[PDB]
Write a protein that binds this ligand. Structure first.
Ligand SMILES: O=C(O)[C@@H]1O[C@@H](O[C@H]2[C@H](O)[C@H](O)[C@H](O)O[C@H]2C(=O)O)[C@@H](O)[C@@H](O)[C@@H]1O
Ligand SMILES: O=C(O)[C@@H]1O[C@@H](O)[C@@H](O)[C@@H](O)[C@@H]1O
Length: 226
């Protein structure tokens, strides 16, 4: 019954919560065994993220989350990685319960300005009962639309194996050994002006009062920069 920080390497993740005040838990406190209604180890050992649709939201989102936010430097969220080189997150997990909207985001690459100011998400792994859509943003200024990458057949409760990789300004998005790519720096050179961090957890795409809540699980989670 050990807390997730004992089962996963959370030394370079902080946790963002869907409580009224959108509390954050540090890497160190995750390692010490932080657990709550929003974040816990289930009977199957999974790191489990729960968030209600009525939860608190961050300053630039309509939606609540129980979600890890990568910290290259666990003591400074303004230290983030760039477009050049290779940057890889791998995970395995499942979504157990959806809100009324039937949509959550279970993994991301998020952009950020050099000064820590918000920038657009780059990759969003959107889960629905029957499909994961690994969406890649076109433009670094947040305008335009997203490039969709549909992986159909993935159901509620099914185990997915996922990888999101950036190598030299190209995003490679993988679900169960099936990989698609989007050259994001090639769509917009402006992406070279931004930095990036991974996210993984449960970002609930429903903020309605009667929308219920969602549960997402992870069985493995690793990040590498090379
Ligand atoms: O809505 C936003 O601005 C959020 O930005 C990111 O989280 C940042 C936010 O300021 C949050 O309250 C806390 O201070 O962490 C910040 C960070 O880690 O950069 C982003 O991860 C997401 O929560 C949302 O887009
Ligand atoms: O998690 C995300 O994708 C992000 O949450 C936060 C928002 O400001 C926006 O950057 C985006 O929706």
């Amino acid at each position: 019954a050990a807390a997730p920080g004992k089962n996963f390497d959370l030394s370079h993740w902080k946790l963002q919560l869907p409580d009224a005040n959108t509390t954050e838990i540090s890497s160190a406190n995750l390692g010490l065994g932080y657990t709550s209604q929003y974040f816990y180890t289930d009977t199957d050992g999974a790191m489990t993220f729960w968030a209600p649709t009525t939860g608190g939201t961050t300053a630039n989102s309509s939606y609540p989350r129980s979600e890890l936010r990568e910290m290259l430097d666990p003591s400074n969220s303004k230290v983030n990685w760039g477009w050049q080189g290779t940057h890889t997150m791998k995970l395995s997990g499942k979504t157990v319960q959806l809100p009324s909207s039937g949509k959550i985001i279970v993994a991301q690459i998020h952009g950020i300005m050099d000064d820590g100011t918000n920038a657009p998400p780059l990759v969003k792994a959107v889960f629905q009962d029957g499909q994961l859509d690994m969406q890649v943003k076109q433009n670094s200024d947040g305008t335009g639309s997203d490039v969709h990458n549909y992986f159909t057949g993935i159901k509620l409760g099914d185990l997915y194996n996922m990888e999101i990789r950036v190598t030299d300004g190209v995003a490679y998005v993988t679900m169960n050994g099936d990989t698609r790519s989007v050259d994001f720096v090639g769509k917009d050179a402006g992406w070279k002006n931004l930095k990036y961090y991974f996210k993984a957890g449960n970002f609930v795409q429903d903020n309605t009062s009667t929308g219920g809540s969602a549960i997402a699980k992870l069985y493995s989670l690793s990040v590498s920069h090379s």
